[PDB]
């Protein structure tokens, strides 16, 4: 009932569309638990674009 | 005798008839004849509004105001019955007439106070044993004050009592509890008091004139906010006739 | 759809007898209604007293019944309040007040029949529009 | 049909309140103003290049000289209105720029309306009016007009919806 | 709780019959022979304790009494509603067509 | 609840405004729960259906019809000649599923409030305090993306 | 020279940075009064009972408006066409409540704008020009007269004059359509032709001159520096412009005469706006746009709707909702 | 309405102003509603009801004549409003009456 | 209990110190009622300084 | 009440802060009323005074 598109998220859906679904904080946009995304989390993608 | 062409535009039409200074006599009452008031006219000269201290300690006072709706304030052409009671008193029961006027006054600081100045359904009585009407006579009475706006009135967002929306349609998903006092319109009906003091009597014609002080509540915007206490002071004229 | 004799057939008296107006009759009735009545009764409403209209049901509940040709002709000759208690020729157009309502002076019995027939037929064509006011424009 | 389009946009989109339509209006009316003022200024600063009282024959398309006095026109408008053109090339480019830009802005607004992305309301005014039944502005009045338009025109203008609005639900003021 | 008294009134017999104490005078046109004479008398002599009290209106003719008897079933009485009776609304409530 | 939530006009991207800024949550609020499906019935026990708001309308009346599309109730504007009021027609609302599962309401104010929400489709409980939501609809990323890229094109 | 001679010479001097002239002697004080009162009122005036029903409308910024919603509110319907100067009020409080600022502003503005037109004539005379720029200005001025004075005169009240504000203007327009069907009135249609065509011809003329500019500059410089203020020779090739446009449509649809061209540019929008001003000023006396409501009927007599009937539904919505508390009787006769 | 039994002198309208009668800004008794703007109107069918203070309640109650009633109806229904193609009435009226005022 | 110095008023006290005490709106900083200051109210002083 | 209000430290100008901006009202609030003089007493009935 509070998905990303209710929260004004613009770029998050684009990362999710191509396979980025987990955070370094431990959550995933599908609500699963205990999933490790490796480096290519949302945070990792942001850091890569900054560098 | 003044005609409409003589009076129009002068402001005289909003003034009640006066009696010359010679008119200090008595108008006999028969206790057997029937009597009617054929014309009652109230001309207000002062509107006072009771202040709201914000601290309930002090004693709030009535303060003067500025009239902003011009010479549209007088009640006139009122008629009714003047019963002679057993104890010798006289009771006027108003039946019909131009017995209301909306009035807006302005307080210091700019707050506007609308009110329905009225004597609707007036019932007033004198002291016991009034066999004649003299300068010592007074009438004390009560009257009804209905809502300033009537049921069909719609507020700026289209809400009303007998018509209009029942919600704030511009805020479709807002919570309605806080908006209830503005969404639900209410029709007030209160009481007012009036005192008339006879200062001139023309015994031959049955005309009387004098001063009046009335107290009543002001507009409450169909229940949206609390009304103010208002005191109206002015002059009055009345024509008494056997019937 | 067409203006058929079935549409043009309307009640004639209070006993159920019906009459079949001609198309020329109906058109003459419409013209005369515009000439003498539409200033107040455009579209079946009454401008100077909206509480009363020319709907067939309203005419049926009027006293005497006015939902038939003879009733309407009698009204045009001697109009009454809705309950039939008061005669209002002094303030409503009619033959007996034609002196103060000049447009009624030259109307004939056939003309009155045509006007009544128009009043009865038009709701059969227009439905709620007749006597419905601006809501149904 | 185009008139109906206008009124539909007012009633459902509050199109007049949209700053992109406002810029379009400025462009169109300012273009008309420029057209009129420039035509009149030229015609009233002409040089006398012939003896006729009808001055049109005193121009030859192949002539090299200006047919009207830019200096006199500039002086006139400087003293009348405070500012005036002094460069003819800028003047005529501005005549291109104004109406074109206005129409483009209006087009952007309509792209917004394609998604119901309207300039319909002012939220602060709506909050105030909801809480205070004595607060009224021309904005709120126009909103009432829009509500009337929608309710009274939808059933016939959108027949596929099969709207049936009972008479008692139609918004209406007193006596009308 | 704040309540809209007119909406509440619609839930009483006022919402299904002619309320002799509140209803606007134009409603009497629904039934034969009531408008305008008897309607004027009824509105003027309101309020009534019970529906049958409408037969005690002074001056009623026998025919008028018979009409009232025939129509009693279409009448009701409820407590006077100030919002519905003030402003002269029983004679003209701002609804025309 | 996810399917029910899709069936709600507050998630329709054609309900926003150009200068109504921010997330959809800033409007109707943060959705907390499905209140359940509301079934309206009149005094005769026949089920009635609230006409749903089309995307074109900023506001929309409350009209209830039977399964054949015949009007059976509504919320009137003018009351003096009302025939279909909830009070007159004895309209009640019963909830199935969601928070209000199994509850029935007969108080006309409550029933009307639920009908007013039913014009929006499925009915939800929202948290309006966290974001100071103002109760006015906003569009979604789908809408904003479409607007920006059409204009830029 | 005597004092009066010197004063007259100064008033009519063509050397003043802004021309004054005898029309200016009236224009300057009146426009200053109108401007000062308008600015003060727009910022700070209290609510005004426009419709005379003791329901004041808030117009000023300090009382809750923004630039788009603010306005100087027209004077009360209780005043009608009566003259309501400050000294006719018992107090400034009453004057403000009843909307006196609107009357002060519009009267001073109309007088000042008339004098502005006269001043255009007068300065043209002083400078030795031809005189008809003021005639061009008469079109917008006539429009201002129509919406601020003529329509109120016809309808019986300054409360029906156009409000001095943006949203107020929209309100005026919508009510006007509801009550007169202005869209279906030929004079407003001529006005639309006038303004659409004015914008069209503005763009056309600007584009043609710009396309025929003669090369006098390099690509790193604005082409505008190719023209020197007051130069004797023309800065574009009208022969080339005519060749282009004549081939765009056909030879005889293009002006080869600059004087004819500029006369046409002046005439089209000016005449269109004259006619639209007359449209407002004649609907002031309730001669309304075409009414084809229910004009098309079938053989039986069923009404066959047209787009005009759809327009009528919209107009009905506007009519029933406007001024919702002001009408007591079935017909809105003014 | 008075024929129906209304007390027109005391009938309060939705806004608080008299439904049928009110006061002009200088106090004269005048007709209510929007027609408050037209209180300067004078005409032979109306002047018999006017006294020194304006419209007189006693005369309104007792002395309105049938010819006055007829004239008022006639003028109300021939107000000067109509379309360019001479359809009488307000712009939203339907076709039927062929009238534009001289 | 809510005098000017509780409300962050900086220039109002300086007008009051030299004799300006009334407003065109009808109030006075001493709380009196029905006192008319003429032109030299607080508003009048502000307008004079602007001109 | 005016005298009592003067006898209150919230009106002491030496109680503020350099970046505590605005009117005094923005701090303790808009004064509405005097609650009265508070007299403290212990179980023995002796009056006590708060420092
Ligand atoms: C190019 C621009 C004009 C081109 C002409 C196009 C119209 C063709 C002629 C048709 C026409 O006009 O047709 C209309 C009539 C002929 O049609 C008759 O027109 C009548 C018009 O009604 C008039 O007659 C009715 C019947 O008596 C009623 O009396 C009604 O009140 C009264 O207005 C009725 O509709 C008749 O049934 C119909 O046959 O011609 C006329 O009147 C002729 C009018 C010529 C005089 C011009 C009128 C004066 C305009 C004054 C206002 C100018 C300012 C406002 C400008 C906007
Ligand atoms: C002061 C009044 C005013 C003014 C000046 C404008 C001005 C404008 N409006 Mg707004 N309008 C107003 C009030 C006003 N409006 C009000 C009050 C409303 C009510 C809400 C509207 C509602 C409204 C809508 C709904 C729309 C406008 C649009 C427009 C623009 C139209 C541009 C144009 O020329 O398209 C004219 C059309 C074209 C230029 C297209 C190309 C035309 C081709 C080239 C013609 C070819 C013809 C061919 C040769 C043969 C023809 C012959 C044939 C006739 C036989 C313009 C900026 C439109 C807009 O913004 O669009 C982006 C639009 O859709 N207006
Ligand atoms: C493709 C572009 C794009 C899109 C579709 C979105 C979409 C979104 N963003 Mg993002 N954003 C973007 C670019 C974009 N963003 C960029 C570039 C930035 C950096 C500035 C941001 C910074 C940002 C923040 C900080 C936030 C968002 C938020 C949001 C959401 C709400 C948007 C909103 O309220 O718009 C409102 C849009 C308008 C009011 C339209 C403005 C129209 C302009 C002013 C018109 C200008 C006209 C011009 C001057 C005229 C010229 C005149 C002529 C003569 C030339 C939405 C999901 C919000 C959110 O919910 O995030 C969780 C949020 O908080 N965005
Ligand atoms: C003599 C000057 C003076 C004084 C004593 C006051 C006093 C007051 N004003 Mg006024 N004011 C003034 C000038 C003054 N004002 C001017 C000039 C303006 C126009 C900008 C205003 C605009 C104004 C407004 C709009 C408001 C006030 C308000 C107030 C009250 C609260 C003040 C406050 O919170 O301060 C806070 C003060 C600070 C936080 C101190 C700032 C320190 C600066 C930033 C240090 C800068 C250091 C520098 C950059 C370093 C240099 C580096 C070096 C290498 C060179 C108080 C009664 C408020 C009130 O209650 O009104 C009713 C209010 O709302 N005033
Ligand atoms: C107290 C308070 C706050 C009061 C404020 C009240 C208030 C309501 C204010 C708001 C008003 C406001 C400005 C709102 C409007 C906002 C709005 C819609 C903005 C539009 C913005 C915009 C970018 C629009 C896009 C379209 C666009 C570019 C339009 C431009 C329009 C425009 C400037 C046209 C030109 C108008 C103009 C008068 C030109 C004069 C030219 C002139 C001097 C010609 C004379 C001349 C002619 C010749 O031929 C020759 C030869 C010479 C020599 C010569 O000289
Ligand atoms: C698949 C197949 C079969 C294809 C084969 C097609 C084919 C090759 C066909 C061969 C040709 C053929 C047979 C012909 C087609 C016939 C035909 C009629 C079809 C097309 C018709 C049609 C759809 C279009 C006609 C409509 C049309 C475009 C006309 C527009 C006319 C119009 C209103 C013009 C405005 C005129 C006007 C005077 C404007 C003034 C503008 C203005 C003020 C300019 C300012 C200005 C002017 C100057 O002058 C100069 C100087 C300068 C400075 C300047 O400022
Ligand atoms: C260099 C400096 C650049 C900045 C200088 C200019 C300052 C910005 C001026 C523009 C202001 C924008 C107004 C937005 C109002 C606002 O508060 O937004 C504020 C909103 C955010 O919205 C906020 O959201 C918050 C939650 O995070 C809360 O909900 C707040 O209530 C809500 O206001 O900002 C945006 O949405 C920014 C991005 C919007 C992008 C929209 C895409 C569409 C763009 C297409 C437009 C092209 C049109 C061109 C036409 C030609
Ligand atoms: C040209 C542009 C000039 C502006 C560009 C610079 C922007 C201003 C940058 C300075 C910011 C000031 C920070 C104040 C913070 C703030 O919000 O204030 C905001 C405060 C107002 O305070 C607000 O008041 C409101 C009620 O009106 C509410 O209570 C708000 O809560 C409260 O914040 O503003 C001021 O008080 C402005 C005037 C302060 C004057 C203080 C006098 C002392 C000055 C002496 C300093 C000299 C030192 C020099 C040392 C060398
Ligand atoms: C129904 C009335 C509407 C038409 C009124 C006139 C429209 C033309 C005036 C526009 C003024 C523009 C600003 C001044 C622009 C300007 O300065 O113009 C000046 C321009 C040329 O001036 P000249 O001095 O060369 O000629 C005018 C006189 O001096 C006679 O030589 O004048 C004309 O060409 C006048 C044409 C009259 C043509 C015959 C009369 C009009 C008939 C056509 C009207 C058709 C209506 C459709
Ligand atoms: C008695 C009358 C007193 C007049 C009172 C005030 C007149 C004000 C005139 C505008 C002053 C600003 C001109 C700035 C700009 C400026 O100085 O322009 C000066 C400019 C001179 O152009 P030139 O041809 O000299 O220069 C072109 C090249 O040199 C540039 O490369 O004139 C124009 O471009 C005319 C078209 C712009 C016309 C703009 C009109 C704006 C109207 C006002 C719209 C805003 C109203 C907002 C209200 C809130
Ligand atoms: C305005 C001057 C009118 C004209 C012209 C016509 N009528 Fe009329 N009509 C008018 C009023 C005010 C009333 C009601 C009067 C009352 O007190 O009852 C009526 C009523 C009728 C009726 C009865 C309606 C019903 O019973 O439901 C009919 C049948 C009728 N009028 C017919 C009619 C005809 C044929 C007219 C042209 C000859 C005509 N009316 C003109 C007002 C006016
Ligand atoms: O004030 Mn403005 O608008 Ca001209 O019509 Mn009637 O008056 Mn009201 O109503 Mn519609
Ligand atoms: Cl309006
Ligand atoms: Cl009215
Ligand atoms: Fe040019």
From Swiss-Prot, chain B:
InterPro entries: OMP/PagP_b-brl, PsbO
Compartments, as annotated in UniProt: Cellular thylakoid membrane
Keywords: Membrane, Photosynthesis, Photosystem II, Signal, Thylakoid
GO molecular function: oxygen evolving activity
SUPFAM superfamilies linked: OMPA-like
Protein topology in the membrane: Peripheral membrane protein
Textual note on the cofactor: PSII binds multiple chlorophylls, carotenoids and specific lipids.
GO biological process, one term: photosystem II stabilization
Gene3D superfamilies: photosynthetic oxygen evolving center domain, Photosystem II, cytochrome c-550 precursor
Primary localization: membrane
Gene Ontology annotations for the cellular component aspect, listed alphabetically: photosystem II oxygen evolving complex; plasma membrane-derived thylakoid membrane
Summary of the function given for this chain in its UniProt record: One of the extrinsic, lumenal subunits of photosystem II (PSII), which stabilize and protect the oxygen-evolving complex. PSII is a light-driven water plastoquinone oxidoreductase, using light energy to abstract electrons from H(2)O, generating a proton gradient subsequently used for ATP formation. Required for dimerization of PSII and for binding of PsbQ to PSII.
Family: Belongs to the PsbO family.
Assembly and binders: PSII is composed of 1 copy each of membrane proteins PsbA, PsbB, PsbC, PsbD, PsbE, PsbF, PsbH, PsbI, PsbJ, PsbK, PsbL, PsbM, PsbT, PsbX, PsbY, PsbZ, Psb30/Ycf12, peripheral proteins PsbO, CyanoQ (PsbQ), PsbU, PsbV and a large number of cofactors. It forms dimeric complexes.
Protein name: Photosystem II extrinsic protein O
Curated annotation (Swiss-Prot), chain E:
GO biological process: photosynthesis; photosystem II stabilization
GO cellular component: extrinsic component of membrane; photosystem II oxygen evolving complex; plasma membrane-derived thylakoid membrane
Cofactor, free-text remark: PSII binds multiple chlorophylls, carotenoids and specific lipids.
Localization per Swiss-Prot or TrEMBL: Cellular thylakoid membrane
Topology in the lipid bilayer: Peripheral membrane protein
Keywords: Electron transport, Membrane, Photosynthesis, Photosystem II, Signal, Thylakoid, Transport
Source organism, top-level taxon: Bacteria
Location (main, coarse): membrane
Transmembrane segments: none
Subunit comment: PSII is composed of 1 copy each of membrane proteins PsbA, PsbB, PsbC, PsbD, PsbE, PsbF, PsbH, PsbI, PsbJ, PsbK, PsbL, PsbM, PsbT, PsbX, PsbY, PsbZ, Psb30/Ycf12, peripheral proteins PsbO, CyanoQ (PsbQ), PsbU, PsbV and a large number of cofactors. It forms dimeric complexes.
Family indicated by similarity: Belongs to the PsbU family.
Role of this protein: One of the extrinsic, lumenal subunits of photosystem II (PSII). PSII is a light-driven water plastoquinone oxidoreductase, using light energy to abstract electrons from H(2)O, generating a proton gradient subsequently used for ATP formation. The extrinsic proteins stabilize the structure of photosystem II oxygen-evolving complex (OEC), the ion environment of oxygen evolution and protect the OEC against heat-induced inactivation.
Name assigned to this protein: Photosystem II extrinsic protein U
Source organism: Thermosynechococcus vestitus (strain NIES-2133 / IAM M-273 / BP-1)
Residues represented out of the complete protein: 38 to 134 of 134
Swiss-Prot record, chain G:
Pfam family, one: Photo_RC
Topology term for the membrane: Multi-pass membrane protein
Enzyme class: oxidoreductase
Keywords associated with the record: Calcium, Chlorophyll, Chromophore, Electron transport, Herbicide resistance, Iron, Magnesium, Manganese, Membrane, Metal-binding, Oxidoreductase, Photosynthesis, Photosystem II, Thylakoid, Transmembrane, Transmembrane helix, Transport
GO molecular function: chlorophyll binding; electron transporter, transferring electrons within the cyclic electron transport pathway of photosynthesis activity; iron ion binding; oxidoreductase activity, acting on diphenols and related substances as donors, oxygen as acceptor; oxygen evolving activity
Binding site for chlorophyll a PD1: 188
Swiss-Prot/TrEMBL site (Stabilizes free radical intermediate) positions: 180
Localization, UniProt: Cellular thylakoid membrane
Sites where the protein binds a quinone: 205, 254-255
Catalysed reactions, as listed in the record: 2 a plastoquinone + 4 hnu + 2 H2O = 2 a plastoquinol + O2
Binding positions for chlorophyll a ChlzD1 per the UniProt entry: 108
InterPro entries: D1/D2, Photo_II_D1/D2_sf, Photo_RC_L/M, Photo_RC_L/M_CS, PSII_D1
Biological role: Photosystem II (PSII) is a light-driven water:plastoquinone oxidoreductase that uses light energy to abstract electrons from H(2)O, generating O(2) and a proton gradient subsequently used for ATP formation. It consists of a core antenna complex that captures photons, and an electron transfer chain that converts photonic excitation into a charge separation. The D1/D2 (PsbA/PsbD) reaction center heterodimer binds P680, the primary electron donor of PSII as well as several subsequent electron acceptors.
Swiss-Prot record, chain J:
Top-level taxon of the source organism: Bacteria
Subcellular location: Cellular thylakoid membrane
Biological role stated in the UniProt entry: One of the components of the core complex of photosystem II (PSII). It binds chlorophyll and helps catalyze the primary light-induced photochemical processes of PSII. PSII is a light-driven water:plastoquinone oxidoreductase, using light energy to abstract electrons from H(2)O, generating O(2) and a proton gradient subsequently used for ATP formation.
Family affiliation: Belongs to the PsbB/PsbC family. PsbB subfamily.
Subunit comment: PSII is composed of 1 copy each of membrane proteins PsbA, PsbB, PsbC, PsbD, PsbE, PsbF, PsbH, PsbI, PsbJ, PsbK, PsbL, PsbM, PsbT, PsbX, PsbY, PsbZ, Psb30/Ycf12, peripheral proteins PsbO, CyanoQ (PsbQ), PsbU, PsbV and a large number of cofactors. It forms dimeric complexes. Part of a photosystem II (PSII) assembly intermediate complex PSII-I; crystallized from a strain deleted of psbJ, it forms monomeric PSII before addition of the oxygen evolving complex. PSII-I includes 3 assembly factors not found in mature PSII (Psb27, Psb28 and Psb34).
Protein name: Photosystem II CP47 reaction center protein
Native source species: Thermosynechococcus vestitus (strain NIES-2133 / IAM M-273 / BP-1)
Lineage: Bacteria, Bacillati, Cyanobacteriota, Cyanophyceae, Acaryochloridales
Gene: psbB
Part of the intact protein present: 307 to 357 of 510
């Amino acid at each position: 009932l509070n998905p990303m598109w209710r929260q004004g998220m613009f770029v998050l859906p684009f990362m999710a569309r191509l396979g980025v679904t987990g955070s370094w904080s431990g959550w995933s946009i599908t609500g699963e638990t205990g999933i490790d995304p490796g480096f290519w989390s949302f945070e990792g993608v942001a850091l890569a674009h900054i560098v | 005798t003044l005609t409409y062409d003589d009076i129009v535009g002068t402001g005289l039409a909003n003034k009640c008839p006066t009696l010359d200074d010679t008119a200090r006599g008595a108008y006999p009452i028969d206790s057997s004849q029937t009597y009617r008031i054929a014309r009652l006219c109230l001309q207000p000269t002062t509107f006072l509004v009771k202040e709201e201290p914000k601290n309930k300690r002090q004693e709030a006072e009535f303060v003067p105001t500025k009239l902003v709706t011009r010479e549209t304030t007088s009640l006139d052409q009122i008629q009714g019955e003047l019963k002679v009671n057993s104890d010798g008193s006289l009771t006027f029961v108003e039946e019909d007439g131009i017995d209301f006027q909306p009035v807006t006054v302005q307080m210091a600081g700019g707050e506007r106070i609308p009110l329905l100045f009225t004597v609707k359904n007036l019932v007033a009585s004198t002291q016991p044993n009034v066999t004649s009407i003299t300068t010592s006579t007074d009438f004390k009475g009560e009257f009804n004050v209905p809502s300033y706006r009537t049921a069909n009135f719609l507020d700026p967002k289209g809400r009303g009592l007998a018509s209009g929306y029942d919600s704030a349609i511009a805020l479709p998903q807002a919570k309605e509890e806080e908006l209830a006092r503005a969404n639900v319109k209410r029709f007030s009906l209160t009481k007012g008091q009036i005192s008339l003091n006879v200062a001139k009597v023309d015994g031959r014609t049955g005309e009387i004139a004098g001063t009046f002080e009335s107290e009543q509540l002001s507009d409450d915007d169909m229940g949206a906010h609390e009304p103010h206490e208002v005191k109206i002071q002015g002059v009055f004229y009345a024509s008494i006739e056997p019937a | 759809a067409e203006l058929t004799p079935e549409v043009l057939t309307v009640p004639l008296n209070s006993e159920g007898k019906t009459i079949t107006l001609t198309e020329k009759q109906y058109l003459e009735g419409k013209r005369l209604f515009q000439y003498a009545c539409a200033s107040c009764h455009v579209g079946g409403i009454t401008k100077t007293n909206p509480s009363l209209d020319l709907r067939t049901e309203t005419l049926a509940l009027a006293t005497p019944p006015r939902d038939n040709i003879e009733g309407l002709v009698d009204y045009m000759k001697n109009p009454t309040t809705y309950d039939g208690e008061q005669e209002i020729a002094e303030v409503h157009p009619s033959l007996r007040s034609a002196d103060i309502f000049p447009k009624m002076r030259n109307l004939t019995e056939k003309d009155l029949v045509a006007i009544a027939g128009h009043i009865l037929v038009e709701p059969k064509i227009l439905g709620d529009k007749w006597g419905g006011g601006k809501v149904y424009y | 049909a185009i008139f109906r389009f206008l009124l539909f946009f007012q009633g459902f989109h509050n199109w007049t309140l949209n700053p992109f339509h406002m810029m379009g209006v400025a462009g169109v009316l300012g273009g008309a103003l420029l057209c009129a003022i420039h035509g009149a200024t030229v015609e009233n600063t002409l040089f006398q290049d012939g003896e006729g009282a009808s001055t049109f024959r005193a121009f030859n398309p192949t002539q090299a000289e200006e047919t009207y006095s830019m200096v006199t026109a500039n002086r006139f408008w400087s003293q009348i209105f405070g500012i005036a053109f002094s460069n003819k090339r800028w003047l005529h480019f501005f005549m291109l720029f104004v109406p074109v830009t206005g129409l483009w802005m209006s087009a952007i607004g309509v792209v917004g309306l394609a998604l119901n992305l309207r300039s319909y309301d002012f939220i602060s005014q709506e909050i105030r009016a909801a809480e205070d039944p004595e607060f009224e502005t021309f904005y709120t009045k126009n909103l009432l007009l829009n509500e009337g338009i929608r309710a009274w025109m939808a059933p016939q203008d959108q027949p596929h919806e099969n709207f049936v609005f009972p008479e008692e639900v139609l918004p209406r003021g007193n006596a009308l | 709780e704040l309540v809209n008294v007119v909406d509440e009134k619609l839930g009483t017999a006022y919402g299904e019959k002619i309320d002799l104490n509140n209803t606007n005078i134009a409603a009497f046109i629904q039934y034969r022979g009531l408008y305008p004479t008897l309607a004027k008398l009824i509105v003027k002599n309101a309020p009534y304790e019970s529906v049958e009290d409408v037969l005690n209106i002074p001056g009623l003719t026998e025919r008028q009494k018979q009409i009232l008897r025939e129509n009693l079933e279409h009448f009701t009485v409820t407590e006077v509603e100030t919002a519905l009776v003030e402003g002269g609304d029983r004679y003209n409530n701002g609804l025309y067509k | 609840e996810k399917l029910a939530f899709y069936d709600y006009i507050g998630n329709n991207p054609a309900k926003g405004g150009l200068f109504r800024t921010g997330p959809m949550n800033k409007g109707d609020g943060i959705a907390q729960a499905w209140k359940g499906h509301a079934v309206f019935r009149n005094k005769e026990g026949e089920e009635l259906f609230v006409r749903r708001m089309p995307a074109f309308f900023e506001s929309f009346p409350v009209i209830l019809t039977d399964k054949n599309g015949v009007v059976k109730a509504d919320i009137p504007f003018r009351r003096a000649e009302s025939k279909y009021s909830f009070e007159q027609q004895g309209v009640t609302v019963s909830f199935y599923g969601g928070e209000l599962n199994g509850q029935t309401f007969t108080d006309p104010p409550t029933v009307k409030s639920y009908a007013r929400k039913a014009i929006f489709g499925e009915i939800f409980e929202f948290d309006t305090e966290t974001l100071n939501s103002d109760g006015i609809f906003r569009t979604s990323p789908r809408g904003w993306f479409t607007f920006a890229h059409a204009v830029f094109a | 020279a005597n004092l009066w001679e010197r004063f007259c010479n100064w008033v009519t001097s063509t050397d003043n940075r802004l021309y004054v002239g005898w029309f200016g002697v009236i224009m300057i004080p009146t426009l200053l009064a109108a401007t000062i009162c308008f600015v003060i009122a727009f910022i700070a005036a209290p609510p005004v009972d426009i419709d005379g029903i003791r329901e004041p409308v808030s117009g000023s910024l300090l009382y809750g408006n923004n630039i788009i919603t603010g306005a100087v509110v027209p004077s009360s319907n209780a005043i009608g066409l009566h003259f309501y100067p400050i000294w006719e009020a018992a107090s400034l409080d009453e004057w403000l409540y009843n909307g006196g600022p609107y009357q002060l502003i519009i009267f001073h503005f109309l007088l000042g704008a008339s004098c502005y037109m006269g001043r255009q004539w007068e300065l043209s005379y002083r400078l030795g020009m031809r005189p008809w720029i003021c005639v061009a200005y008469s079109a917008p001025l006539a429009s201002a007269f129509a919406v601020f004075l003529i329509y109120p005169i016809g309808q019986g009240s300054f409360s029906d004059g156009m409000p001095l504000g943006i949203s107020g203007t929209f309100n005026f327009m919508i009510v006007f359509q509801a009550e007169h069907n202005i869209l279906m009135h030929p004079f407003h249609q001529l006005g639309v032709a006038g303004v659409f065509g004015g914008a069209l011809f503005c763009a056309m003329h600007g584009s043609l001159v710009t396309s025929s500019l003669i090369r006098e500059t390099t690509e790193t410089e604005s082409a505008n520096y190719g023209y020197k203020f007051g130069q004797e020779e023309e800065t574009y090739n009208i022969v080339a412009a005519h060749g282009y446009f004549g081939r765009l449509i056909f030879q005889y649809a293009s002006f080869n005469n600059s004087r004819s061209l500029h006369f046409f540019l002046a005439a089209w929008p000016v005449v269109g706006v004259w006619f639209t001003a007359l449209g407002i000023s004649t609907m002031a006396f309730n001669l309304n746009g075409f009414n084809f409501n229910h004009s098309v009927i079938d053989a039986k007599g069923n009404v066959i709707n047209t787009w005009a009937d759809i327009i009528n539904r919209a107009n009905l919505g506007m009519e029933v909702m406007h001024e919702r508390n002001a009408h007591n009787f079935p017909l809105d006769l003014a | 309405d008075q024929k129906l039994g209304a007390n027109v002198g005391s009938a309060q309208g939705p806004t608080g102003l008299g439904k049928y009668l009110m006061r002009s800004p200088t106090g004269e008794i005048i007709f209510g509603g929007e027609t408050m703007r037209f209180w300067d109107f004078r005409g032979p069918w109306l002047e018999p009801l006017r006294g020194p203070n304006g419209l007189d309640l006693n005369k309104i109650k007792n002395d309105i004549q049938p010819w006055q009633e007829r004239r008022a109806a006639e003028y109300m229904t021939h107000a000067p409003l109509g379309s360019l193609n001479s359809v009488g009435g307000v712009a939203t009226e339907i076709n039927s009456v062929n009238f534009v005022s001289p």
